[PDB]
């Protein structure tokens, strides 16, 4: 059948929102009131992959954009990028592995682990207005826990 998707927003555990800045540039900042319109709305697709009660493979596309978060080696490191796709072909149930995150529910928060790069997570910095990145530990000063808000 089709792939199933939900619209949503994400905020890090310090309650920073994710907003688009430069071309293909996703950053996190503290946001409230009128400025909340600037936050990125995701289309979270439920995709093919290894699954358990608390570990659900997803893709994260930008709502009504042919852009997906992906995990690739860049200058020899697991990095987070926004990648363009053919809008006729996406989303799909069998997303390529670089697009797949394991959405993990622990203690009423979510972590998004790269399916391609085990133990690398969507991360934010404590500082305002810094890139969203792929970080190689769910431990230390960088933030790897999020909450989801469901959108119409
Ligand atoms: C100036 C700025 C640059 C970035 C930036 O490079 N963000 C990278 C993330 C990875 C996925 C897409 O965005 N944010 S503010």
From Swiss-Prot:
Major localisation: cytoplasm
Source organism superkingdom: Eukaryota
Effect of residue 117 to C: No effect on binding to IL1R or on IL1B activity. Markedly reduced activity. Markedly reduced activity
Residues annotated as site: Important for interaction with integrin: 55, 63, 65, 74, 88
Modification note: Activation of the IL1B precursor involves a CASP1-catalyzed proteolytic cleavage. Processing and secretion are temporarily associated.
Subcellular location(s) of the protein: Cytoplasm, Cytosol; Secreted; Lysosome; Secreted, Extracellular exosome
Regulation: (Microbial infection) Cleavage by S.pyogenes cysteine protease SpeB promotes its activation independently of CASP1. SpeB-mediated maturation of IL1B plays a dual role depending on infection site: while IL1B inflammatory response prevents bacterial growth during invasive skin infections, it promotes streptococcal infection of the nasopharynx by disrupting colonization resistance mediated by the microbiota.
Induction comment: By LPS. Transcription and translation induced by M.tuberculosis and a number of different M.tuberculosis components in macrophages; EsxA is the most potent activator tested (at protein level). In pancreatic islets, release is increased by high glucose treatment. In pancreatic islets and macrophages, release is also increased by endocannabinoid anandamide/AEA.
GO biological process: apoptotic process; astrocyte activation; cell-cell signaling; cellular response to interleukin-17; cellular response to lipopolysaccharide; cellular response to mechanical stimulus; cellular response to xenobiotic stimulus; cytokine-mediated signaling pathway
Keyword annotations: Cytokine, Cytoplasm, Inflammatory response, Lysosome, Mitogen, Pyrogen, Secreted
Tissue: Expressed in activated monocytes/macrophages (at protein level).
One function term, GO molecular function aspect: integrin binding
Quaternary structure (record): Monomer. In its precursor form, weakly interacts with full-length MEFV; the mature cytokine does not interact at all. Interacts with integrins ITGAV:ITGBV and ITGA5:ITGB1; integrin-binding is required for IL1B signaling. Interacts with cargo receptor TMED10; the interaction is direct and is required for the secretion of IL1B mature form. Interacts with HSP90AB1; the interaction facilitates cargo translocation into the ERGIC. Interacts with HSP90B1; the interaction facilitates cargo translocation into the ERGIC.
Summary of the function given for this chain in its UniProt record: Potent pro-inflammatory cytokine. Initially discovered as the major endogenous pyrogen, induces prostaglandin synthesis, neutrophil influx and activation, T-cell activation and cytokine production, B-cell activation and antibody production, and fibroblast proliferation and collagen production. Promotes Th17 differentiation of T-cells. Synergizes with IL12/interleukin-12 to induce IFNG synthesis from T-helper 1 (Th1) cells. Plays a role in angiogenesis by inducing VEGF production synergistically with TNF and IL6.
Misc note: The IL1B production occurs in 2 steps, each being controlled by different stimuli. First, inflammatory signals, such as LPS, stimulate the synthesis and promote the accumulation of cytosolic stores of pro-IL1B (priming). Then additional signals are required for inflammasome assembly, leading to CASP1 activation, pro-IL1B processing and eventually secretion of the active cytokine. IL1B processing and secretion are temporarily associated.
Family indicated by similarity: Belongs to the IL-1 family.
Entry protein name: Interleukin-1 beta
Organism the protein comes from: Homo sapiens (Human)
Lineage: Eukaryota, Metazoa, Chordata, Craniata, Vertebrata
Name of encoding gene: IL1B
